[PDB]
Amino acid sequence: WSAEDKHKEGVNSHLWIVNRAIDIMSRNTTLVKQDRVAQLNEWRTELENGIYAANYENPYYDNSTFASHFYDPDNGKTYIPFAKQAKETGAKYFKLAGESYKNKDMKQAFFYLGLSLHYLGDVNQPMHAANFTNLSYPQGFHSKYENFVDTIKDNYKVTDGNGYWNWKGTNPEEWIHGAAVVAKQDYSGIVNDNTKDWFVKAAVSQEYADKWRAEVTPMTGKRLMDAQRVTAGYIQLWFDTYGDR
Numbered sequence: 001w002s003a004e005d006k007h008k009e010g011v012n013s014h015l016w017i018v019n020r021a022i023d024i025m026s027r028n029t030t031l032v033k034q035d036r037v038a039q040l041n042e043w044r045t046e047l048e049n050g051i052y053a054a055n056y057e058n059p060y061y062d063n064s065t066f067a068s069h070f071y072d073p074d075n076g077k078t079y080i081p082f083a084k085q086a087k088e089t090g091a092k093y094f095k096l097a098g099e100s101y102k103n104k105d106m107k108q109a110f111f112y113l114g115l116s117l118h119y120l121g122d123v124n125q126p127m128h129a130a131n132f133t134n135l136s137y138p139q140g141f142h143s144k145y146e147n148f149v150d151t152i153k154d155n156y157k158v159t160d161g162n163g164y165w166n167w168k169g170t171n172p173e174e175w176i177h178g179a180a181v182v183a184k185q186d187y188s189g190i191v192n193d194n195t196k197d198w199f200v201k202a203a204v205s206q207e208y209a210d211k212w213r214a215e216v217t218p219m220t221g222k223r224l225m226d227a228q229r230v231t232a233g234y235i236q237l238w239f240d241t242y243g244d245r
């Protein structure tokens, strides 16, 4: 997903997915300790910094190849042979965040949590779980899709407090893998001969540009809602793990 601006949801789907996940935690009145939501906002600057850094600097963006932002659950690999992938990279920062949290270094803890949230966010994007990059055919489709997503995401906010509490085990890796498994299933609903064709023709016909946008919207909405619920449960797991209990 996009992350064009460090502090604005308008062009940052990643931040939007997290803010909505936090809203799910606020809406929950039976399980979530609201003190946790208070902490996230208290260190919101470090959180958002982490969410944004993943796409603009090393080692997070792997020299502009973003190899660590992909993870195919079937073979457990990214699109580049022998490169680091999203599951191990996301888990890495989840743990680094927790250790800094236990040493009372909040700035460090939430920066790292932000990075981890970014990776978990990417595997909910079908293309990232199937190694379809911006250079994959049709080229340019990957980024134009993620840009289009920012214009319609607000129509798919989860308005209840039911996140996927303890969705997977206690190992962050299981959550990233589990999320990628679900996103890869919805891959075909976004990337297929039709969308490929219309996206190519869209170049010379405004008529087609709208055609693929419409075709990918339903599945996009479904992917966005899941991402919010899984992220909410992921954040809750982090706090239960390092929250000193």
Ligand SMILES: CCCCC(=O)OC[C@H](COP(=S)([S-])OCC[N+](C)(C)C)OC(=O)CCCC
Residues within 6 Å of the ligand: 001, 002, 003, 004, 055, 064, 065, 066, 069, 122, 132, 133, 134, 135, 142, 143, 146
């Ligand atoms: C100018 C063309 C770059 C387009 C692009 O979508 O780059 C970032 C994504 C993956 O990262 P995510 S978190 S979904 O980043 C989307 C936002 N931007 C483009 C601003 C980093 O990586 C690629 O598809 C690999 C090939 C690069 C030419």
Ligand SMILES: [Zn+2]
Residues within 6 Å of the ligand: 001, 002, 003, 014, 121, 122
């Ligand atoms: Zn992304």
Ligand SMILES: [Zn+2]
Residues within 6 Å of the ligand: 001, 125, 128, 142, 146
């Ligand atoms: Zn992408």
Ligand SMILES: [Zn+2]
Residues within 6 Å of the ligand: 001, 054, 055, 066, 069, 118, 122
């Ligand atoms: Zn990314």
